[model samples]
Target: APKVLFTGVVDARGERAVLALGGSLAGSAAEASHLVTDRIRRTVKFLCALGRGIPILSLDWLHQSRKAGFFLPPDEYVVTDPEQEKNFGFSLQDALSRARERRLLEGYEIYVTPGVQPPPPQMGEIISCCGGTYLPSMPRSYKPQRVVITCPQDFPHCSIPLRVGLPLLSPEFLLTGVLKQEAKPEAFVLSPLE
Candidate 1:
């Protein structure tokens, strides 16, 4: 709590309000915390001072600002005036992509079996989110390194069909960032469930 940060929140007001403790005037705090009624009364009017926005300097961002040497508090967010979004060792998009993709499926093309077809839109969304290619049908010349089976027991057709060693992913597996699981023969669904 180097800097005293506070939002529309009540107590812990001096504790670097680094966090929101969020609650609009109407009520959004925990059951036990809100029952007191005292805090809510003050919060009703206090909301005017801090409206619906997160208004605190994150410690990391504060450090970045000091390091950048300049920033513009354009409201809603503080942005670096110089071609930022990227600088010395930071690129905002790169940081975001790092978190979003573990690349477990990036090295291979996924082949979905038609007979046991799951919803394409949902599966496609998950596949891309975790970072990889999705195909409704395999290209004739291209070989799929993995197979997502939907057919009950009957092996689906593919470029590398029946290569007992190929990775077999289920529809649900697309959502996980399971890197390095393809080489292993058993329990290839690598990621721990959320």
Candidate 2:
């Protein structure tokens, strides 16, 4: 039986639905055999499951399971939204394959400055799960491969990375890079536009 982790707004009834399929709820991302979500969400659980290369399905999978009276193959039910893919500039299917081939953010190091939405802990979890190193503080030593993730609102704290000549990036860089499973730091460099 798969230990399913539900992200987004699933109420208690959703648990009953999983129970009906002989699947138990996964208490954490590490314990999950599958992840269920309505869409591509940036939540910790969703990204963690994606980083681990687990099948992420839409809510309809549960509904279809209830209709068929058995667990349906999850592959066909993988979550996708054409509009969201366009807006985010990445394909869900491609991201999954990339993650499977190599964890997104693998060999990269990321640092999150204060005032970044989703905050540090959440961002850190996403980074680490994708096989990247998360530094609580900026490293004293310089490494071209390391980057700092910050938002416009945190511009005041951005001086350090700028002074150190480290690549400062927006959160989108981390998000899209993970989705594409390809690090393109140059595309998201934060210094000029701000």
Candidate 3:
């Protein structure tokens, strides 16, 4: 039975359908076989599910399964929001495939400054979910494969990365990178060091 997880409010009908189909609700992303969400969101659970390479499906997948009295192929039910796709500048389908091949932040060490919007905890969790090592504090010395996600407000705290020649990127860099399952640091570079 598939262990399904949802990003937003639980759907009562969908829950019933999963039970009827002999599946179960997954409490955490780690245990989920599939993730259901209506739109592309940057929530931790959403990123975690993507990082794990599980199928991210639309609610229709569940509804149709209940109506058809069996599970439907998830391919047709994959969420496709073109507007969000354009906004984010990446294809969700492509991102999923990349995640299946490799974790988005694998082999990278990431540090988040305290002043980034949506707060450091949220950013750190997303980083870890994408398989990046999250450092709680900045190191005085540089480490290989290290990068910093910071905002202008935290520029004063970014001296280490600047001195070490590490890439300093905006938080959106991590968000879109995880969404695309690819790193495009040059596009999201927060500091211009020539």
Candidate 4:
């Protein structure tokens, strides 16, 4: 039931943006994807309500797992990138191994799973070179959401759409149904980071 969305922005003569949503379903993946898409659409509408002409480039939605197959304890989720895993200083399996070695994971079942986005192409190659299976596809198809807006230059700042899941800052919390609005520096903050 947790959904993750990735949004990208390109600031050029005309700013273009893209939104991708990935998540698994409790009942049906299809239904969940639809619901997530609708929720994102509503969010986009809200952004429009701010009276800023920020164009949405694309929207993509995908299912990462099913309720039954995917399981994470109160403080666990998938970390698909090696850089991220390195930040943890251990593979998911290695973490489990260490936990078991220390008897910290007793009576706890741990499984290593992939997240919504597979590793980047280069990372996949590294994984294969290291004798790991290259996970090329997500658990579901990617749905792309796209939009365009005029007069983006008129607004001092604009916000992008993002879905909720585990907190990037704190891995222990499961963030759900949360929308993060990122604003331009000049409009939302005192000064832009230069």
Q: Which candidate is the best by TM-score?
A: 3
Model 3: per-residue Cα lDDT over 56-157, one tens digit each = 999999988988999888999998889988887888898889888888888888888888876788777777777788888886667667888888888887
- TM-score of each candidate structure, all chains considered together: 0.34, 0.81, 0.86, 0.16
Q: Report the lDDT tens digits of candidate 1 across residue range 1-194.
A: 12223333353432222233222222221111111112111222222111211222233343343455443242323222224222323432232234334444455566566544445554554444334566677444435455554444434353254444445555544322221112222443322122
- Model 2, residue 194: distance off in Å is 6.5
Please list the residue runs of candidate 1 whose C-alpha ends up more than 4 Å from where it truly belongs after superposition.
Answer: 1-104, 139-145, 153-160, 163-165, 176-185, 188-194
What residue runs in model 3 are displaced by over 4 Å at the alpha carbon?
192-194
Per-candidate clash tally:
2, 0, 0, 10
Clashing pairs in 2: none
Give one digit per residue, the lDDT tens place, for model 4 in 1-194: 34222322222211111121123322322112122222122222222211121111122212222323331231223223355334433343343233233322112111112321221343233222222343343212212211111122312321221121111111110011011121111222111112
- Which window of 10 residues has the lowest lDDT sum in candidate 2? 174-183
Candidate 3 weakest lDDT stretch, 10 residues: 185-194
Which model is ahead, 1 or 4, in terms of TM-score?
1
Model 1 CA lDDT for position 93: 29
Which candidate leads in lDDT? Answer: 3
Candidate order, lDDT descending: 3, 2, 1, 4
Clashing pairs in 3: none
TM-score of 1: 0.34
Choose 1 or 2, whichever is better by TM-score: 2
**Error at 105, model 3, angstroms:** 0.7
